[PDB]
């Protein structure tokens, strides 16, 4: 595995060059954004983002070393979290707004169009304002996002084999490398040791909030599946049920 042999700088550049593009939605400002069209737009957007995410994940150092069954599992667990941290990162420079797409910028007053969504909107806004306060760096964000991929389903594995634990062990060695990378970045920005450990902890605690937002979001999503989404996003919701 080359992932454990990457220097910190190579790790950052690998992650930066794998960044997916920022996709546009088919939002028509003249059309009245009803509740049905609002979710239509969000759903079409996420479905196209999933294709890019799957090819992004292949380029995360260490990911392709895992079995295909494990790759599937990690992505099934983490896809909404990954969508959400991307959303929150593109939204940093837009206080009080969520930039779902360069042409879809929303405040909390929208999304009340969709019942139960304004609470999650509020939480995504507060995460975005938190990243703004910390002045999160792009090199730190791609580390965080890679940590979500490798971490969110690492304790939900079947792991029926002693060798299925050896798969968990490699994921932890990669996670440790990314921690090393984050610390490297903070020392280079002039932070002291105490400041490095403090910032490192602050960023990882925000991941617990991202897990919370995704779980609440997922709960509403496979409840909305009951009410009257495409095939890939259908199998993704079904995984959390």
């Amino acid at each position: 595995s080359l992932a454990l042999s990457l220097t910190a700088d190579q790790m950052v550049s690998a992650l930066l060059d794998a960044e997916p593009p920022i996709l546009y939605s088919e939002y028509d400002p003249t059309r009245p954004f009803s509740e049905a069209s609002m979710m239509g737009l969000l759903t079409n957007l996420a479905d196209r983002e999933l294709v890019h995410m799957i090819n992004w994940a292949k380029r995360v150092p260490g990911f392709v070393d895992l079995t295909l069954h494990d790759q599937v599992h990690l992505l099934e667990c983490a896809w909404l979290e990954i969508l959400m941290i991307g959303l929150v990162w593109r939204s940093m420079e837009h206080p009080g707004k969520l930039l779902f797409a360069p042409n879809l910028l929303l405040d909390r007053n929208q999304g009340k169009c969709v019942e139960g969504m304004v609470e999650i909107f509020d939480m995504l806004l507060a995460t975005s304002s938190r990243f703004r306060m910390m002045n999160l760096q792009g090199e730190e964000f791609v580390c965080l996002k890679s940590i979500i991929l490798l971490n969110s389903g690492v304790y939900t594995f079947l792991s029926s084999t002693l060798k299925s634990l050896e798969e968990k062990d490699h994921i932890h060695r990669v996670l440790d490398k990314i921690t090393d990378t984050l610390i490297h970045l903070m020392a280079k920005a002039g932070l002291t040791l105490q400041q490095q450990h403090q910032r490192l902890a602050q960023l990882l605690l925000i991941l617990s909030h991202i897990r919370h937002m995704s779980n609440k979001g997922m709960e509403h999503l496979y409840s909305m599946k009951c009410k009257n989404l495409s095939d890939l996003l259908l199998e993704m919701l079904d995984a959390h049920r």
């Binding site: 799957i54 292949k58 790759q71 599937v72 890939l232 199998e235």
Partner: peptide
């Protein structure tokens, strides 16, 4: 084989 499984596999 689900969709995600195929897309991960496309070489």
């Amino acid at each position: 084989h689900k969709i995600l499984h195929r897309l991960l596999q496309d070489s």
